[PDB]
Structure formats: C-alpha cells, structure tokens
Amino acid sequence: MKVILLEPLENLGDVGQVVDVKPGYARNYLLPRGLAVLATESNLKALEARIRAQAKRLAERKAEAERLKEILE
RNA sequence: CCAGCCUAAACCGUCCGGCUUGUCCGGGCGGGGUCGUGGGGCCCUCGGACACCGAAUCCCCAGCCUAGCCGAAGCUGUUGGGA
Numbered sequence: 001m002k003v004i005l006l007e008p009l010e011n012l013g014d015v016g017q018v019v020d021v022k023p024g025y026a027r028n029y030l031l032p033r034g035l036a037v038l039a040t041e042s043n044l045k046a047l048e049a050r051i052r053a054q055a056k057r058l059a060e061r062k063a064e065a066e067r068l069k070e071i072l073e
Numbered sequence: 074c075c076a077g078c079c080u081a082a083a084c085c086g087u088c089c090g091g092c093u094u095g096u097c098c099g100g101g102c103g104g105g106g107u108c109g110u111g112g113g114g115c116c117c118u119c120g121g122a123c124a125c126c127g128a129a130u131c132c133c134c135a136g137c138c139u140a141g142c143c144g145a146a147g148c149u150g151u152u153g154g155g156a
C-alpha cells in the first residue's frame with residue numbers, strides 16, 4: 001500500500017512524502033501510530049492543495065518583497 | 074400479455090465537522106444525469122413558449138360484491154288413503 005507520511009521516517013522518507021510500504025507495516029504500525037495516512041485519491045488531492053497553497057503563499061511573499069527591491073534600493 | 078422507469082459518477086449551490094484554514098477534505102440535502110445509431114458533464118452558436126406526450130400516484134364516477142324484489146297460464150269429473 002502507498003501512504004503519505006506525516007513525519008520524517010528513517011528508511012522511508014521525509015514528511016509530506018508518498019511512499020510504498022507493505023500493508024502490514026502500514027495498517028499495524030504506520031497507520032495506527034498516526035505516523036502516516038492512506039494514499040487515498042481523496043488525500044492525494046488534499047495534498048494538491050497543501051502543496052500549491054504554501055507554494056503560492058511564497059510564490060507571492062516573494063512577488064511582494066520584490067517591490068521593496070524596486071524602490072528601497 | 075404487453076411498459077417502461079429511477080439512480081451512481083462528472084458538474085453547480087448549500088448546511089454540518091474534521092482540521093495541517095485550503096480554490097480541500099468528508100459526510101447530508103437540492104439541482105443536474107441516465108445512455109450503445111454510445112451517452113452525459115462542462116464551454117460556445119440556434120426558435121420555442123401559449124407546443125404537445127403523460128402515468129404504475131392521487132381525486133370523482135360507472136360497473137361489480139356484500140340483503141333483496143317482480144315474475145306468465147287450470148278447472149271439472151274420475152280410481153284412489155292420497156292425483
């Protein structure tokens with residue numbers, strides 16, 4: 001099973017990552033310990049918006065301090 | 074004997090709660106949609122309301138069921154316990 005994991009995990013990967021486990025690992029450890037969540041299409045999508053909306057949250061807090069470079073220099 | 078229909082999904086509005094507040098995610102209601110000459114969603118351009126079609130639902134009636142009622146035309150002998 002593939003999960004997205006909410007915490008950097010040794011052999012696995014870092015947070016936010018989507019990785020393939022053996023279900024046993026997922027259903028009996030990852031999932032239970034809340035260290036990861038099911039790669040549901042219902043959640044790969046809930047990652048589209050976590051992804052884009054902290055990317056444009058700085059794909060604009062840079063487009064903003066760019067004027068402080070237009071006239072404060 | 075005769076007859077065909079409703080939906081799920083995209084898509085839109087909504088209300089609720091979950092939260093890492095996100096143009097999201099999930100659940101509920103509504104709309105939308107229902108097909109194989111493929112169909113629907115969405116986006117463009119066009120004539121449709123007064124078009125007509127129409128129930129398997131509902132309303133009234135007829136008819137029927139559960140009691141009934143009307144209904145024609147004969148009398149005398151005669152054997153016989155009795156016609």
Ligand SMILES: [Mg+2]
Nearest residue numbers: 021022023024
């Ligand atoms: Mg196995």
Ligand SMILES: [Mg+2]
Nearest residue numbers: 041042045098
């Ligand atoms: Mg969705």
Ligand SMILES: [Mg+2]
Nearest residue numbers: 045046048097
């Ligand atoms: Mg979506």
Ligand SMILES: [Mg+2]
Nearest residue numbers: 080103104105
């Ligand atoms: Mg419906």
Ligand SMILES: [Mg+2]
Nearest residue numbers: 082083084085
């Ligand atoms: Mg949807």
Ligand SMILES: [Mg+2]
Nearest residue numbers: 084085086087
């Ligand atoms: Mg919606």
Ligand SMILES: [Mg+2]
Nearest residue numbers: 086087088089
């Ligand atoms: Mg309102």
Ligand SMILES: [Mg+2]
Nearest residue numbers: 080104105106
């Ligand atoms: Mg409908």
Ligand SMILES: [Mg+2]
Nearest residue numbers: 121122123124
């Ligand atoms: Mg009108």
Ligand SMILES: [Mg+2]
Nearest residue numbers: 125126127128
């Ligand atoms: Mg009719």
